[PDB]
DNA sequence: CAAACATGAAGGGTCC
DNA sequence: GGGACCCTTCATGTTT
């Protein structure tokens, strides 16, 4: 009821945070729209995918300010961001 | 064959 | 709303 907290409409359970109710319904439908761009495994959260990335950013240290996708070279980051505008 | 242990994935908290 | 990191539980694998 309160602005800090959400009733979840599939199972009720009361999640905190304004913005953190969809992170918690992708739980439900096995949603998982982030995906490394290297090994394309996907994640549920960019929470999860940051974390993933730090596997190739030893290898791959360009990395994209928008995506967070990983380069081995800086004129394939700049290529990337072709993408984005 | 089980119990302990390591590691990491998953999910929810919590603070900018 | 988003990013970031924390905290706890639990699943899986390996060691003892
Ligand atoms: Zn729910
Ligand atoms: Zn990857
Ligand atoms: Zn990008």
């Known amino acids: 009821l309160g602005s ?5 409409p599939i199972c009720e359970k009361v ?3 304004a913005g953190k109710l969809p992170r918690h319904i992708r739980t439900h439908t096995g949603e998982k729209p982030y995906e ?6 996907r994640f549920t959260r960019q929470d999860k995918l ?8 030893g290898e791959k240290p360009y990395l994209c ?4 996708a ?3 070279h800086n004129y394939d980051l700049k290529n ?3 993408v984005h505008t």
């Open 4 to 8: 800090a907290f959400q009733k979840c």
């Open 15 to 17: 999640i905190q945070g």
């Open 36 to 41: 490394c761009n290297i090994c394309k495994v």
């Open 50 to 57: 940051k974390v993933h990335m730090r596997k190739h950013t």
């Open 65 to 68: 300010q928008q995506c967070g």
């Open 70 to 72: 990983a380069f081995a």
């Open 80 to 82: 990337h961001m072709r």
